[PDB]
Design a protein around this nucleic acid. Structure first.
Ligand SMILES: [Zn+2]
Length: 73
RNA sequence: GUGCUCGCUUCGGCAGCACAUAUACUAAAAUUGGAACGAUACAGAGAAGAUUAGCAUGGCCCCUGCGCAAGGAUGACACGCAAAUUCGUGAAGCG
């Protein structure tokens, strides 16, 4: 609508570093917490809970998902 | 260390007295371990977004800023909790 919102659409289009990405949520949160704010949210709690519950299924799960993706591309 | 005893009493020594009252992360540190929007290289506004409202509660936090300026950027599965009888139980009291 406005010049500011349009510039913000440019920025928010710009796709950036993992530093705020959480896989457990698959939520690339944003801007100076991201990850720890997942953690604060009850979600990341249940999620890292399940992770510690079955640590060596997620490693392999993701490893493959990625691996097939890379062959694909 | 200063000064004094009609001090021993010479001027050499000893004593007694008057004071003068307790520095200081004392270490040459012993040790201990890290990050850049840096260089290159790439790459190229990557539409995917209409996510159809805003303000709250609230301590959800960090940054710029001298700010009781100003300004950034963020958290929603925010719920089931149950007023309400029914008997049973025990306790008390009265006869
Ligand atoms: Zn997360």
């Amino acid at each position: 609508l406005t010049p500011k919102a349009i510039a913000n659409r440019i920025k928010s289009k710009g796709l950036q570093k993992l530093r705020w990405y959480c896989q457990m949520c698959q939520k690339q949160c944003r801007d100076e917490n991201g990850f720890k704010c997942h953690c604060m949210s009850e979600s990341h709690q249940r999620q890292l809970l399940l992770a510690s519950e079955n640590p060596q299924q997620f490693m392999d799960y993701f490893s493959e998902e990625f691996r097939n993706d890379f062959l694909e591309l």
